[PDB]
Swiss-Prot record, chain A:
It is found in: Virion. Capsid protein self-assembles to form an icosahedral capsid, with a T=9 symmetry, about 77 nm in diameter. Each asymmetric capsid nonamer is covered by 9 capsid auxiliary protein, 1 copy of the trimeric head fiber protein and 2 copies of the dimeric head fiber protein. Displays an HK-97-like fold with an insertion domain that protrudes at the capsid surface. Interacts with the auxiliary capsid protein (via FD region). Interacts with the head fiber dimeric protein. Interacts with the head fiber trimeric protein. Interacts with the portal vertex auxiliary protein. This is Major capsid protein. It comes from the Viruses. It comes from Bacteroides phage crAss001 (Bacteroides phage PhiCrAss001).
From Swiss-Prot, chains C, E:
It comes from Bacteroides phage crAss001 (Bacteroides phage PhiCrAss001). Auxiliary capsid protein that forms an outer layer on the major capsid protein protrusions. The central region FD is structurally similar to Helicobacter pylori flagellar cap protein FliD. Residues 75-237 are annotated as: FD. The lineage of its organism: Viruses, Duplodnaviria, Heunggongvirae, Uroviricota, Caudoviricetes. It is found in: Virion. This is Auxiliary capsid protein. GO terms for cellular component: viral capsid, decoration. Keywords: Capsid decoration protein, Capsid protein, Virion. Interacts (via FD region) with the major capsid protein.
Curated annotation (Swiss-Prot), chains D, F:
The chain holds residues 1 to 38 of 97 of the full protein. Homotrimer. Interacts with the major capsid protein. Forms short fibers at the surface of the viral capsid. It comes from the Viruses. This is Head fiber trimeric protein. It is found in: Virion.
Length: 50, 51, 333, 38, 333, 38
């Protein structure tokens, strides 16, 4: 709105709302590939299955 | 530890000494001052005569 | 799937019998047409976009015409009874680890060298009876083989009590020890499972296995613990998946050889078979030869597919129409 | 075929791979429990 | 404690619901006020410095309105029962060292990575009965634990005899073997202990734990000697310590923020909620939407607290007066 | 705790650190004497 505590900018040419607050927004995109899952063996205890 | 037999070449609980009484004259004695638990836990003795 | 051919194989769906060419109204029809002098036979089938015919079967040049039921095209899911070999020990011994290995033989691939080994294991305690062992082992095998994580269904595992002796109780990864409350368990049966299937892209196959036992020490000797014997199978896979994949291949002979290759632009062949209905298969196999020095023949075959209801009403009516119209002695199944 | 090299006299359960000699009993490990001779 | 808010949280204390204004004379009274067309709603509450009227709730702009019966805010102290299971041995094995490792967590820390361990050890004898083992283990538990001269201990150790089966004998560090004269002890109970609480500086926290066992050998194999099963709790913590911390924070959303920082020069804000009684809660969460450019909502909430006499009478009189004046339908508990 | 390692077959008694076997009788050194097992 009026001030921006994330940068320190008192005054606003382009206001987003009028309630004198500031919301940060972040986005990201991630991803993990496993080519072959028969090349990883595993022994898990049976109380971890569910 | 039935698995591992504790011999004389590594423990040395009796040792050859030099004396006038016999050529192959032998000592006797041993003591443990350390235990080494699994996953890196080593305990060492420190004897304070204050105790 | 992809099949092998004797120089051609073409399929026509016999969803109905209309007995003359004028009654070809709805899709899936068939009319076995032949002349009054029985020398050529052909089938007028109703395509989804018009009337089409078959090749003119020379009735003096047929080699065999044998129709099979739906129960000759069902793969029986094989079973294996896991029991305690009483020559070793009728009771579970008080100390040993009782591990059972399941040796699959065609995992992912088509070879016998692409194996897969899953395990189920019970630490046997003092006072454990024979039935308490089967209660703990069919749970420990189900949490390995019938979990919600495995990409393919490996085996279906059942338990048989001594009071029923035929009725199977299903165990899964969610089966708790209070669900199985019976002190008369005498075997653990490990049955094959049907694989997931996509029309024309993923064929129908199975993963065969062998329950192999690990060794336990009775006395001072390591006595292979258990015995695993084959039981006569009870559950059979349906026929409709093998016949849905059989038309998809045989429509490419009379049609476009590629099916979806390059997709902005395909000629969509509309099929007429249901993968959830059982069918019957009739195969008139023949050849062609001309009256000259070319005595070499060109073998062919024609598959007909009609729906099966258990009493074979549509196929025997299809056989009975071909036999009187063409003069061929096809065996009514 | 199952070798036991040593024997241990004890009032407790000594070890799986040894002979438990009490006063008038000779127990050894067999089939998950201590089988007495005689 | 500090809480998370939806841009504000305002708390008002309901001690006695008078009928209207000029009847509010003592500190802590309240009356919900509204108009004849049921447009706005506000609570005129008597602060100890005068009448303080709350924020006006626009009745078209209410998200939810729900109340809490004050038994949904009481913490239950978990009880574990330590018994020798009949699977391993119902009697203590004469040569084995029985060590019980209590695995505590969150100790004088805020995370579960701050773990603490207390113990209890009894080496059994030849004529060792099971009931004398539960007598001797609990005293050895009361020596490693229950020795804090400074503060109250982490857990409470009890003993239940089988002749009583419902009344627990308390075991403390002063308790010797001769004080426990029963011969039928069958379990040890490890109850949680209510941690210290001061108003506005330390919250109501707890130290969770899990009684764990070290392996004894019975038939040459290392087995866990006991089982720790959780039974239903019998002793609960009342609601006095959570609600007084809630008034400590939501009186700083209206009044003084500097709650005892510059210590001679503070504003002494009197608190109305006493920690020696249980308290119901009623929440009203609303918003405000402006005209023609400011459509964004500034969401708010109003919390009301009233003393609970067990029968939920003082809260039901408060909900019964809001539903008449404002017209909302809050569930009377 | 006294660990016996050897078994000796002799008509007379061997040392206290071995087990005595003769004609069908097992004896080992317990309570200062040779005690029969059976
Ligand atoms: Mg893997």
């Amino acid at each position: 709105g009026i001030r921006n505590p994330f940068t320190g900018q008192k005054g606003n040419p382009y206001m987003s709302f009028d309630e004198d607050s500031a919301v940060i927004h972040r986005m990201a995109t991630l991803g993990v590939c496993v080519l072959d899952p028969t090349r990883t063996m595993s022994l898990i205890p049976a109380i971890l299955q569910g | 530890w039935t698995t591992f037999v504790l011999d004389n070449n590594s423990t040395r609980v009796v040792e050859k000494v030099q004396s006038r009484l016999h050529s192959n004259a032998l000592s006797a004695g041993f003591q443990f001052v350390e235990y080494k638990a699994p996953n890196g836990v080593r305990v060492r003795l420190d004897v304070d005569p204050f105790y | 799937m992809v099949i092998s051919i004797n120089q051609v194989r073409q399929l026509y769906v016999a969803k109905a019998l209309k007995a003359n060419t004028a009654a070809l109204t709805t899709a899936g029809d068939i009319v076995p047409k032949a002349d009054t002098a029985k020398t050529t036979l052909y089938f007028q089938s109703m395509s989804p976009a018009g009337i089409v015919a078959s090749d003119k079967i020379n009735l003096k040049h047929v080699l065999y015409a044998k129709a099979t039921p739906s129960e000759a095209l069902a793969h029986k899911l094989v079973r294996y009874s896991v029991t305690l070999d009483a020559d070793v020990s009728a009771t579970p011994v008080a100390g040993q680890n009782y591990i059972l290995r399941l040796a699959f033989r065609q995992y992912i691939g088509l070879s016998e060298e692409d194996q897969y080994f899953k395990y189920g294991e019970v630490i046997a305690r003092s006072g454990m009876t024979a039935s308490d062992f089967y209660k703990k082992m069919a749970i420990s095998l189900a949490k390995n083989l019938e979990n919600k994580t495995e990409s393919t269904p490996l085996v279906n595992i059942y338990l048989i009590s001594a009071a029923a002796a035929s009725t199977d109780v299903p165990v899964t990864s969610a089966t708790k020890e209070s669900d199985l409350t019976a002190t008369d368990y005498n075997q653990i049966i490990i049955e094959e499972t049907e694989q997931p299937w996509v029309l024309g892209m993923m064929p129908q196959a199975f993963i065969p296995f062998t329950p192999q036992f690990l060794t336990i020490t009775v006395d001072g000797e390591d006595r292979l613990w258990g015995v695993a014997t084959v039981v006569t199978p009870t559950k059979t896979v349906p026929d409709g998946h093998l016949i849905a994949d059989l038309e998809y291949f045989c429509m490419g002979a009379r049609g476009d050889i590629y099916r979806g290759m390059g997709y902005p632009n395909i000629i969509k062949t509309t099929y007429l078979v249901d993968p959830g209905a059982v069918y019957d298969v009739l195969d008139i196999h023949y050849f062609y030869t001309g009256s000259n020095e070319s005595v070499q023949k060109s073998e062919k075959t024609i598959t007909l597919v009609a729906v099966d209801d258990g009493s074979h009403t549509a196929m025997n009516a299809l056989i009975g129409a071909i036999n009187t119209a063409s003069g061929l002695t096809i065996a009514t199944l | 075929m199952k070798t036991l090299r040593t024997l241990k006299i004890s009032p407790n359960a000594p070890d799986i791979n040894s002979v438990w000699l009490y006063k008038g009993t000779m127990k050894y490990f067999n089939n998950g429990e201590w089988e007495t001779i005689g």
